[PDB]
Short mmCIF file of C-alpha atoms and ligand atoms in Angstrom, two decimals:
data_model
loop_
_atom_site.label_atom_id
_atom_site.label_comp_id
_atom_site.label_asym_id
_atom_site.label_seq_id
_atom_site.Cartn_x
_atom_site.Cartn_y
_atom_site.Cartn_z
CA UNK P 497 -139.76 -124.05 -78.90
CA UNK P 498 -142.68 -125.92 -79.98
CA UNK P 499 -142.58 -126.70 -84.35
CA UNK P 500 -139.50 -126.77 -85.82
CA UNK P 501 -137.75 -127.50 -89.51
CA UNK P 502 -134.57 -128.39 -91.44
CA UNK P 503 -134.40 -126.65 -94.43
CA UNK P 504 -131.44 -126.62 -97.71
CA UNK P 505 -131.24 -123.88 -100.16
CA UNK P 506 -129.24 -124.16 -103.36
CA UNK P 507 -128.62 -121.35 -105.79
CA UNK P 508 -126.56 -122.54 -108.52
CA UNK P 509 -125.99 -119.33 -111.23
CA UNK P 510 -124.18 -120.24 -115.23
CA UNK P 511 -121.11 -118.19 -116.08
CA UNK P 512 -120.94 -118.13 -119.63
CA UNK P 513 -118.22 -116.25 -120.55
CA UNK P 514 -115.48 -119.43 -118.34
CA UNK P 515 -115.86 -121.75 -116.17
CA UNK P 516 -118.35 -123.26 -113.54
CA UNK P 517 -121.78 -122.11 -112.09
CA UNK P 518 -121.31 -120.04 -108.88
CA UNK P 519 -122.84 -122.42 -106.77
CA UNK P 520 -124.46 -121.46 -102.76
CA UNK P 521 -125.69 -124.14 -100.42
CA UNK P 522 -126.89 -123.03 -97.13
CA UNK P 523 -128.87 -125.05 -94.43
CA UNK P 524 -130.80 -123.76 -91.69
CA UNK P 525 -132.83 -125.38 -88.19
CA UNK P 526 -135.43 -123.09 -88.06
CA UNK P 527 -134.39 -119.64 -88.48
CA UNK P 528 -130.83 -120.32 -87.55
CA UNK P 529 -127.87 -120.88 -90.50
CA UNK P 530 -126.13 -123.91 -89.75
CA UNK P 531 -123.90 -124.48 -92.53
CA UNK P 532 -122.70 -123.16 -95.81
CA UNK P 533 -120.70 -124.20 -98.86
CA UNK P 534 -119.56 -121.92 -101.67
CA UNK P 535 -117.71 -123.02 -104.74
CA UNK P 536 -115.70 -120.01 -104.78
CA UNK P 537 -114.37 -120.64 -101.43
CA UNK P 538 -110.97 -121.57 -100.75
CA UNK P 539 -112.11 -124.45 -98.58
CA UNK P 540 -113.91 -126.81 -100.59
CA UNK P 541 -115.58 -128.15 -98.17
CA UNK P 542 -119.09 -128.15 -96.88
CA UNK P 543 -118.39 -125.55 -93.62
CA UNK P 544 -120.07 -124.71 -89.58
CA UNK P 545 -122.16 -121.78 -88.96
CA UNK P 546 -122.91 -122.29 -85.55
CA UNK P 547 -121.15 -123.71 -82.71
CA UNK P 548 -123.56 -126.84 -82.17
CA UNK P 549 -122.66 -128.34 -85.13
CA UNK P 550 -118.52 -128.10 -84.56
CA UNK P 551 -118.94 -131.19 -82.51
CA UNK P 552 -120.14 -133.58 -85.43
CA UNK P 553 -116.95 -135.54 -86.66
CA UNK P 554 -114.99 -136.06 -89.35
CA UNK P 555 -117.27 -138.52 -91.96
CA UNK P 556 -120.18 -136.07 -91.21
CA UNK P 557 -117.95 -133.03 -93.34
CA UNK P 558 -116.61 -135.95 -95.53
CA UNK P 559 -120.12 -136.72 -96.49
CA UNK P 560 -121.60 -133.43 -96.24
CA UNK P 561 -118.91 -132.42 -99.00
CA UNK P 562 -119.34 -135.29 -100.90
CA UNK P 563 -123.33 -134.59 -100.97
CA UNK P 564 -123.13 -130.76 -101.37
CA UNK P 565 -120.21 -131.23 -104.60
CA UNK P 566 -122.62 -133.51 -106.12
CA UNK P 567 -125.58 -131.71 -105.80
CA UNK P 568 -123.46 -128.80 -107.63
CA UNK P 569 -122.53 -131.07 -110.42
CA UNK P 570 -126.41 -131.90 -111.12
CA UNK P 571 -127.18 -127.93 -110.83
CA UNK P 572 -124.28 -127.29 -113.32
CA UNK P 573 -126.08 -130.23 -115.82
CA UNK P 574 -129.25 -128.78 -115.31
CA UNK P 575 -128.23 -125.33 -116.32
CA UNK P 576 -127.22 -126.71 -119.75
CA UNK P 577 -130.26 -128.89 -120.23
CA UNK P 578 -132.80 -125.80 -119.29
CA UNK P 579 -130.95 -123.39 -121.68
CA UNK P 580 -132.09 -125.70 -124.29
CA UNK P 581 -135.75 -126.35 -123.31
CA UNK P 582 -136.19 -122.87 -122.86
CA UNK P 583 -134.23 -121.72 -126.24
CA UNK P 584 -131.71 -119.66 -124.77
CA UNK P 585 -128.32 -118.43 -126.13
CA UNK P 586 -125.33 -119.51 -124.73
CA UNK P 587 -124.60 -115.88 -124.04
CA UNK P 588 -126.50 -115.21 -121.04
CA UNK P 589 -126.56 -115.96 -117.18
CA UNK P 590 -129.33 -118.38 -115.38
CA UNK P 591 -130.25 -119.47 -112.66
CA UNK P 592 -131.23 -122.67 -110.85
CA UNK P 593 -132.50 -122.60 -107.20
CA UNK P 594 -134.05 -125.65 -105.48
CA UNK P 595 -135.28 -126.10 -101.38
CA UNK P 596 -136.21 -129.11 -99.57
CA UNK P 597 -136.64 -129.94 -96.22
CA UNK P 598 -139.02 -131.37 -93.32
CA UNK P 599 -141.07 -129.68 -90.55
CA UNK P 600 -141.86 -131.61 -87.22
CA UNK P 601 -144.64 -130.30 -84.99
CA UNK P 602 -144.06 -129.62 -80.70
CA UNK P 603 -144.37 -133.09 -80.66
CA UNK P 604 -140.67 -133.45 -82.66
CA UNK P 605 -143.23 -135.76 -85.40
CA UNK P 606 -142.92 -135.64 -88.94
CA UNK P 607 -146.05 -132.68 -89.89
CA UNK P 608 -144.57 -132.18 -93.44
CA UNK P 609 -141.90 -132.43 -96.04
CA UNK P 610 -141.08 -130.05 -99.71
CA UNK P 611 -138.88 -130.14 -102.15
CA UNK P 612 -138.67 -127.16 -104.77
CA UNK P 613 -137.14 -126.20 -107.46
CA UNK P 614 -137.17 -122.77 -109.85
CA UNK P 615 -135.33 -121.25 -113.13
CA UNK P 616 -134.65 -118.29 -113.53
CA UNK P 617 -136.60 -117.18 -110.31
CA UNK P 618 -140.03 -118.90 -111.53
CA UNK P 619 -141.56 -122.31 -110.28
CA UNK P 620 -140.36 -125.56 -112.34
CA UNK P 621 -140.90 -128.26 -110.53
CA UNK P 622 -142.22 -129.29 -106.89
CA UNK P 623 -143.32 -131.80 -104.82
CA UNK P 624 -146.91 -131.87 -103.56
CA UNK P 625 -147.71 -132.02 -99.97
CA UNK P 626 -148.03 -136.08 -100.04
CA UNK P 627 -144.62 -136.61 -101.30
CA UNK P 628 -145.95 -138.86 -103.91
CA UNK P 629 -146.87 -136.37 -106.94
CA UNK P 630 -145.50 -134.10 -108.64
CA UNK P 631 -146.80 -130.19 -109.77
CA UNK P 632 -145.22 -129.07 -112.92
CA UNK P 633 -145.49 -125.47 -114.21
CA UNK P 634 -144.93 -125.76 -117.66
CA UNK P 635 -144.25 -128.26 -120.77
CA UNK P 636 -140.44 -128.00 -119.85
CA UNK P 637 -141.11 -129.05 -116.66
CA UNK P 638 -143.84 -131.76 -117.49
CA UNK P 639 -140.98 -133.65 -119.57
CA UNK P 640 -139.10 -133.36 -115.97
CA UNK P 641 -141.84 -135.19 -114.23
CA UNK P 642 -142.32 -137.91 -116.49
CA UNK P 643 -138.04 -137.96 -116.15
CA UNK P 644 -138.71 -138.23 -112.65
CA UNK P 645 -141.68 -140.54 -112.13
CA UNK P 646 -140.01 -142.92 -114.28
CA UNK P 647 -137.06 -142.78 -111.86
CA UNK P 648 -139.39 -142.97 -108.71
CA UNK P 649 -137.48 -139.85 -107.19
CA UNK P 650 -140.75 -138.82 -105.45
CA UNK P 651 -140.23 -142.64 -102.99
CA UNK P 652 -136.80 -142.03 -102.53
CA UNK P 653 -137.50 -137.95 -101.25
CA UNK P 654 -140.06 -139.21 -99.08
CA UNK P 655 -138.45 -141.40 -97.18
CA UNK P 656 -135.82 -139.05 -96.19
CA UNK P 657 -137.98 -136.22 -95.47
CA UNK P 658 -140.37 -138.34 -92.82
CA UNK P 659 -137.17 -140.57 -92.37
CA UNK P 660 -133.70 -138.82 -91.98
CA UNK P 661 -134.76 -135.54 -91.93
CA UNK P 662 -136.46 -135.69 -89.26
CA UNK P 663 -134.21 -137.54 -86.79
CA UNK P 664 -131.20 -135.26 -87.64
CA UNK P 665 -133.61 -132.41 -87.15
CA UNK P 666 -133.96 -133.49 -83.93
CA UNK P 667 -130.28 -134.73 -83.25
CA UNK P 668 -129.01 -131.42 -84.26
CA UNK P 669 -132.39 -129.31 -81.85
CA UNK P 670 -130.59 -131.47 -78.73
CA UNK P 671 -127.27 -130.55 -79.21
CA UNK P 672 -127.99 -126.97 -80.06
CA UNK P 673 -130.55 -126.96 -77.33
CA UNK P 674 -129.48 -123.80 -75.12
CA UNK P 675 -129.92 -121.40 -78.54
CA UNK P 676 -132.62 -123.49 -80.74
CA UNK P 677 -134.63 -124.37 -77.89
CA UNK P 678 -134.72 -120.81 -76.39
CA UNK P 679 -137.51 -118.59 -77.65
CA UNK P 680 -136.05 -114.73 -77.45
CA UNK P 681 -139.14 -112.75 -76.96
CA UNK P 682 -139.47 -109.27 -78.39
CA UNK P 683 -137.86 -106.16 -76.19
CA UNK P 684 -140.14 -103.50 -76.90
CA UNK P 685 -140.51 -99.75 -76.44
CA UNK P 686 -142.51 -97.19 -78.01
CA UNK P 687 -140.94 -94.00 -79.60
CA UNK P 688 -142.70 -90.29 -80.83
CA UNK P 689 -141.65 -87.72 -83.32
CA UNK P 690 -144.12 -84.66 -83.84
CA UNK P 691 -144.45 -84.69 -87.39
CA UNK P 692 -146.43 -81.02 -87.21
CA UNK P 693 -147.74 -79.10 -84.26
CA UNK P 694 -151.02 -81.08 -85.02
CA UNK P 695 -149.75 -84.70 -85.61
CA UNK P 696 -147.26 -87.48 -84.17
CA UNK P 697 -145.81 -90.85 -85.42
CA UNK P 698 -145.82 -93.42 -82.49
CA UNK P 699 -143.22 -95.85 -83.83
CA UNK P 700 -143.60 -99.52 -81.56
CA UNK P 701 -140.32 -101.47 -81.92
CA UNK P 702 -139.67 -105.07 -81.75
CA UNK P 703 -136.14 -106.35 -80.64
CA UNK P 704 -133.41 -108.70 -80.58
CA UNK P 705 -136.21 -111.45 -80.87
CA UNK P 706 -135.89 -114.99 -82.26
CA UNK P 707 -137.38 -116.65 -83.97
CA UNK P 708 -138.36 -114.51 -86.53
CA UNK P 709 -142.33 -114.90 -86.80
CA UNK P 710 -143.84 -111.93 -85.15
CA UNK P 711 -146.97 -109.75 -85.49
CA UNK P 712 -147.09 -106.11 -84.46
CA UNK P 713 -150.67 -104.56 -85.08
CA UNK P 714 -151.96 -100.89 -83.93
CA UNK P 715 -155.30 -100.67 -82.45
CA UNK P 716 -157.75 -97.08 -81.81
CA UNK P 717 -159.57 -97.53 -79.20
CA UNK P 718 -159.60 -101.14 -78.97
CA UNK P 719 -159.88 -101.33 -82.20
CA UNK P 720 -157.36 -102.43 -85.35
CA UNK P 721 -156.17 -99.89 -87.48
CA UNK P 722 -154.57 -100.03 -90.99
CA UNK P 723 -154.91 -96.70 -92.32
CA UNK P 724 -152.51 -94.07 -91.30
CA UNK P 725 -150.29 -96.93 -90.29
CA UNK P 726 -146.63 -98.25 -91.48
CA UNK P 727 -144.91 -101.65 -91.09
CA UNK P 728 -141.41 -102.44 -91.90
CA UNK P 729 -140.29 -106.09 -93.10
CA UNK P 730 -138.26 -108.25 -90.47
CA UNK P 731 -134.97 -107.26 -90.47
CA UNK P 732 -131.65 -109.91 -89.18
CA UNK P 733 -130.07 -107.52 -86.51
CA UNK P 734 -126.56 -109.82 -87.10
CA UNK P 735 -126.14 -111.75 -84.13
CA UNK P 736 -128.81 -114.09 -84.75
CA UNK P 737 -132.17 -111.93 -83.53
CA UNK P 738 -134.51 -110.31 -85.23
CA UNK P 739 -136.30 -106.72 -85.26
CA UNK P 740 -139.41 -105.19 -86.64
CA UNK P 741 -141.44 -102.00 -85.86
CA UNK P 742 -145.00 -100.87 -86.87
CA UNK P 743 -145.96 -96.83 -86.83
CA UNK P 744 -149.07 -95.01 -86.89
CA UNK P 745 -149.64 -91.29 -87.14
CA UNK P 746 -152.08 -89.91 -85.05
CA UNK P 747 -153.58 -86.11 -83.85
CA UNK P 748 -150.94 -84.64 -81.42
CA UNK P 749 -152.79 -85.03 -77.88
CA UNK P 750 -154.77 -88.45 -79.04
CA UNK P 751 -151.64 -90.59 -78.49
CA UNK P 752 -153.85 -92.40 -75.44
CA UNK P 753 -156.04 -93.96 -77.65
CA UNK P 754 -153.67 -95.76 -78.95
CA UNK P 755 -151.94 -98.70 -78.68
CA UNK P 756 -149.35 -101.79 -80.11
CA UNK P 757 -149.69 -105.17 -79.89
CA UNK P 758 -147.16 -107.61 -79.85
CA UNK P 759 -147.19 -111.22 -80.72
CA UNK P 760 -144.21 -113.50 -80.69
CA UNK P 761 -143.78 -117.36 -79.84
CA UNK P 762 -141.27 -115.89 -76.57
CA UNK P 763 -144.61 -114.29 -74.99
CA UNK P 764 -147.27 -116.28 -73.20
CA UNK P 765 -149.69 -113.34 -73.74
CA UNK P 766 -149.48 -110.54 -76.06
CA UNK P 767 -148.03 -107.60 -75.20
CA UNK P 768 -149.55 -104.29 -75.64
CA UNK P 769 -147.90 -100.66 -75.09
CA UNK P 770 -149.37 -97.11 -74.88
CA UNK P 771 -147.76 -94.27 -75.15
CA UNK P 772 -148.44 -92.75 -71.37
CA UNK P 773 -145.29 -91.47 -71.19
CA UNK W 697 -136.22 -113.75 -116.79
CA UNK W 698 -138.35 -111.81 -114.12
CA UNK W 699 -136.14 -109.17 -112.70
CA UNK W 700 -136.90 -108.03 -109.54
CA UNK W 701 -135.61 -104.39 -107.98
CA UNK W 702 -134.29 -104.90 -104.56
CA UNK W 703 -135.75 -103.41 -101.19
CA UNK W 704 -133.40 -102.03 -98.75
CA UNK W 705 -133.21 -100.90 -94.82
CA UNK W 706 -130.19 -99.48 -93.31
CA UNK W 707 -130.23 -99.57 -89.50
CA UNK W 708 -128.01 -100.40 -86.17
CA UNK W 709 -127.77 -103.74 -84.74
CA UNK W 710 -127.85 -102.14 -81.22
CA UNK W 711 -129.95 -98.85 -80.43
CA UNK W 712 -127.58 -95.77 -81.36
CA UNK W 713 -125.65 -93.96 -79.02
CA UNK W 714 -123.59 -91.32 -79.80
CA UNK W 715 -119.65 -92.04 -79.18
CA UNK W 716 -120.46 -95.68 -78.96
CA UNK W 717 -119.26 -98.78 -80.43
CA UNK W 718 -122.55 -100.50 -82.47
CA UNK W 719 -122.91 -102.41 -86.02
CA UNK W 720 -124.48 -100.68 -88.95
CA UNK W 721 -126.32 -103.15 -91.40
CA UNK W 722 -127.65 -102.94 -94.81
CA UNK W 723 -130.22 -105.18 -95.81
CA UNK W 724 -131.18 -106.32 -99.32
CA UNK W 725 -134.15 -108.42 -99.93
CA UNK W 726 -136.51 -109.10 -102.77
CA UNK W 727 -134.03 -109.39 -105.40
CA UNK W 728 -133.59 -111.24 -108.57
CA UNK W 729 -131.37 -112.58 -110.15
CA UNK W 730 -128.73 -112.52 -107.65
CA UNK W 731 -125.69 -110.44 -108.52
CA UNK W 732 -125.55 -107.31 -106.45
CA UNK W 733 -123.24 -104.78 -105.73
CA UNK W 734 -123.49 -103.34 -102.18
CA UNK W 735 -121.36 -100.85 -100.12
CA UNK W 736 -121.53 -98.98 -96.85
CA UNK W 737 -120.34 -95.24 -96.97
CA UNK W 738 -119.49 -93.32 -93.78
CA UNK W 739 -119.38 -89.45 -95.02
CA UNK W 740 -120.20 -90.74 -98.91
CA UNK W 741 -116.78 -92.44 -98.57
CA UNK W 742 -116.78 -96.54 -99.20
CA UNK W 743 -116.04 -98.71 -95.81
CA UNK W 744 -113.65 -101.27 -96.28
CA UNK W 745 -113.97 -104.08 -93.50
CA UNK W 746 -117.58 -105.03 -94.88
CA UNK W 747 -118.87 -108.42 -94.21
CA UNK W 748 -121.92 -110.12 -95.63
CA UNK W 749 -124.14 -113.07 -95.25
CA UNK W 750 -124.23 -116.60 -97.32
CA UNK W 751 -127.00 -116.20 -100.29
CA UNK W 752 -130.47 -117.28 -99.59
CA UNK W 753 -134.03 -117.38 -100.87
CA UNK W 754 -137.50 -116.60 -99.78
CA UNK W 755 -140.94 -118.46 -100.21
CA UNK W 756 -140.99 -116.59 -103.50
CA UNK W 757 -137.90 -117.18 -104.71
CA UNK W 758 -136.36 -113.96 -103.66
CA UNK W 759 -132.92 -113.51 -102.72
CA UNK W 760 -131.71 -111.46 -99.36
CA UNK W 761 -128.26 -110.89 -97.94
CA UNK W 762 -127.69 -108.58 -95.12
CA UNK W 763 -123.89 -106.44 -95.36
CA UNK W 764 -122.89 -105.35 -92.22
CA UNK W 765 -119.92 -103.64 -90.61
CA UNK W 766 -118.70 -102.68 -87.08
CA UNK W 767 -119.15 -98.92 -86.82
CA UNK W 768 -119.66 -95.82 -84.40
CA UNK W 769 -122.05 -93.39 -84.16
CA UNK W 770 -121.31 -89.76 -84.10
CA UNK W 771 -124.18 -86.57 -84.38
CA UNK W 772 -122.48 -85.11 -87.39
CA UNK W 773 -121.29 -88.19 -89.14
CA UNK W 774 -123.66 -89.55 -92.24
CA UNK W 775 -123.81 -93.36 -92.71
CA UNK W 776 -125.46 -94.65 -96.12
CA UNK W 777 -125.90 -97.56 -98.02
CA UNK W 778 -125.77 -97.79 -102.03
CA UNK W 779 -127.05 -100.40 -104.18
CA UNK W 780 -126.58 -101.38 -107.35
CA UNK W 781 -128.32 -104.23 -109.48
CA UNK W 782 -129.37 -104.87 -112.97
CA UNK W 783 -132.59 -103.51 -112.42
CA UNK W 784 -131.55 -99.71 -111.34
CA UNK W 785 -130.45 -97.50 -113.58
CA UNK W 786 -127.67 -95.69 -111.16
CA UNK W 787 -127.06 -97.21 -107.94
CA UNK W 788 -129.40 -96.22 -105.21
CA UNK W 789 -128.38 -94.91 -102.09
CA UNK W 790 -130.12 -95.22 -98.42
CA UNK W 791 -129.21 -92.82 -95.63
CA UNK W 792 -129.12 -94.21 -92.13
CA UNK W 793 -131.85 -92.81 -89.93
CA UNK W 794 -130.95 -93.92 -86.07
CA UNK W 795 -135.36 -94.06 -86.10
CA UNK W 796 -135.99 -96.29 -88.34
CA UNK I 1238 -128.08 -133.99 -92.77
CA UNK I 1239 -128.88 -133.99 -96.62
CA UNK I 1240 -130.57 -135.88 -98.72
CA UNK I 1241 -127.90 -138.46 -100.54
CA UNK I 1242 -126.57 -139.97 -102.35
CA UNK I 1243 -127.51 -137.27 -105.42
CA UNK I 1244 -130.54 -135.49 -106.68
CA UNK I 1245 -131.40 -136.51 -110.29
CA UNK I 1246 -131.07 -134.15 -113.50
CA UNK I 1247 -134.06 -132.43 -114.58
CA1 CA H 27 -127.47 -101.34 -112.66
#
């Protein structure tokens, strides 16, 4: 399905009053989760979220883990380190999140590569678009960079995101190849409710549709039209597809004039529906 | 630091059908920091056998989980979802609307 | 695959 991407999120929260940082990894291809670790977990261990990735053996996990449990460690230093920067009490809960990952276009070659990272839900630190620079946000963060240029961390990232990244991006988009290479394109129907005798809400629905990018527009008369309209965020359905819908309200008996239109990877033209029911 | 209030849809996974096995979902998004209580009520009553997804960010640093449990749709039967996170001052609750 | 062997410390 044309572009695709690797991504790794990291949440790492403090827990002042005992212990360790609650710590989440999760990594996706595309919009599909394909692994997780937790550190509250029973397991330990860095664990599948979809079938394709069962197959890989057992020094893939091992280092996985050993990646993943090291990456928490850092998170858990880093917690300490911003408290003080930032003048914080010992008291209260933070937060730490970074991403990182690598996008490859239909052509399955490097296009791009990120690396992020945020405290307390606000940008820190990132990587700029050539992988050689960094952007920091504030003075906190400009100490970081120097930390970090010194170190030449920005080399190291970019050869694993147009390196590594990108050839286990593809690995893993062959062996999951009958789900991450199928585009699900939107099953669509249109729906009315009289809101008075003198007006009706056409509601246009978007189903069970993967990936996730869609756009679902209302047009009078050939026309686009905002005003009068609603759109709901894209939703997970829980088996891996997505839904959306978009409504308009319109003069009971002008439904004709009408009409949705649909735009999703899964459709080689748009779609558009009327209500002629 | 920034607190952000979370936004929430309640829905099926599968168009409703009265009688009929289906999966209702609750869907936070937009939320920091990420603690979060969540719970699916069938008659204002809490479900038990509620699962959830792994924690995960937006582009904006946002966090989103969707809860989920298998349930079935009657006519007289209310399904709901209630929330509760540092930035509400009671938790909120979301009644399921087989339209939306 | 992730990037290894360890991110640094801010
Ligand atoms: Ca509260």
């Amino acid at each position: 399905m044309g572009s695709h991407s690797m991504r790794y999120f990291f949440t790492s929260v403090s827990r002042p009053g005992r212990g360790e940082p609650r710590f989440i990894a999760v990594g996706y291809v595309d919009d599909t989760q394909f692994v997780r670790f937790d550190s509250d977990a029973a397991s330990q261990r860095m664990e599948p979220r979809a079938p394709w990735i069962e197959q890989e053996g057992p020094e893939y996990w091992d280092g996985e883990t050993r990646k993943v449990k090291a990456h928490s460690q850092t998170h858990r230093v880093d917690l300490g380190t911003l408290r003080g920067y930032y003048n914080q009490s010992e008291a209260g809960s933070h937060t730490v999140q970074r991403m990182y990952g690598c996008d490859v276009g239909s052509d399955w070659r490097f296009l791009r590569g990120y690396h992020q990272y945020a405290y307390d839900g606000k940008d820190y630190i990132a990587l700029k678009e050539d992988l050689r620079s960094w952007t920091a946000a504030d003075m906190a963060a400009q100490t970081t960079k120097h930390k970090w240029e010194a170190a030449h961390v920005a080399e190291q990232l970019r050869a694993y995101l147009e390196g590594t990244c990108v050839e286990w991006l593809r690995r893993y988009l062959e062996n999951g190849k009958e789900t991450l290479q199928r585009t699900d394109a939107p099953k669509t129907h249109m729906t009315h409710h009289a809101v008075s005798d003198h007006e009706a809400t056409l509601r246009c629905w978007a189903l069970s549709f993967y990936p996730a990018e869609i756009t679902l527009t209302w047009q009078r008369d050939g026309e686009d039209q905002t005003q009068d309209t609603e759109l709901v965020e894209t939703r997970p359905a829980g088996d891996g597809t997505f839904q959306k819908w978009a409504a308009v309200v319109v003069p009971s008996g002008q439904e004709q004039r009408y009409t949705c239109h649909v735009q999703h990877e899964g459709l080689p033209k748009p779609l558009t529906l009327r209500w002629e029911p | 630091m920034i607190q952000r209030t979370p936004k929430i849809q309640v829905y099926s996974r599968h168009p409703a059908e009265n009688g009929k096995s289906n999966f209702l979902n609750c869907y936070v998004s937009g939320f920091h920091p990420s603690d979060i209580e969540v719970d699916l009520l069938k008659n204002g009553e809490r479900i038990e056998k509620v699962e959830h997804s792994d924690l995960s960010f937006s582009k904006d640093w946002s966090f989103y989980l969707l809860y989920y449990t298998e349930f079935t749709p009657t006519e007289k039967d209310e399904y709901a979802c209630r929330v509760n996170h540092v930035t509400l001052s009671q938790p909120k609750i979301v009644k399921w609307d087989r339209d939306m | 695959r992730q990037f290894g062997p360890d991110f640094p410390t801010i």
